[PDB]
Amino acid sequence: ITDILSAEDIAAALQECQDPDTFEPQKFFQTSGLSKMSASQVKDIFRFIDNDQSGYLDGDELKYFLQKFQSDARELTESETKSLMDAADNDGDGKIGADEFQEMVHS
Numbered sequence: 001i002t003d004i005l006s007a008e009d010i011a012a013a014l015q016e017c018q019d020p021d022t023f024e025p026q027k028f029f030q031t032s033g034l035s036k037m038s039a040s041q042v043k044d045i046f047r048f049i050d051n052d053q054s055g056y057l058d059g060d061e062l063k064y065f066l067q068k069f070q071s072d073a074r075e076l077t078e079s080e081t082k083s084l085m086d087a088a089d090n091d092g093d094g095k096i097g098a099d100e101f102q103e104m105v106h107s
């Protein structure tokens with residue numbers, strides 16, 4: 001992830017949602033620089049988060065979202081993982097597909 005995002009933008013993004021329930025998908029994506037990157041770049045990042053390679057984000061992949069940016073970051077709270085899911089899901093399957101992630105990140 002550090003090959004596409006600046007280390008320092010990532011540190012700032014984590015610093016901003018350091019307390020529980022301060023995580024806000026749009027804020028994170030702006031601070032970190034994600035929302036400014038190309039589809040293909042956003043896709044690479046997706047591939048890094050999708051730990052089991054199912055092609056979708058769901059379950060524990062959401063609880064460990066930040067841990068993909070920095071391995072010692074905190075765990076998202078249940079409310080925060082719910083928020084991510086609400087933010088992204090567009091087809092009622094309770095998981096985040098590559099398409100859904102692209103749209104989310106880009107707004």
Ligand SMILES: [Ca+2]
Binds near residue numbers: 055
């Ligand atoms: Ca997965």
Ligand SMILES: [Ca+2]
Binds near residue numbers: 072
């Ligand atoms: Ca650290």
Ligand SMILES: [Ca+2]
Binds near residue numbers: 088091092093094097
């Ligand atoms: Ca979905």
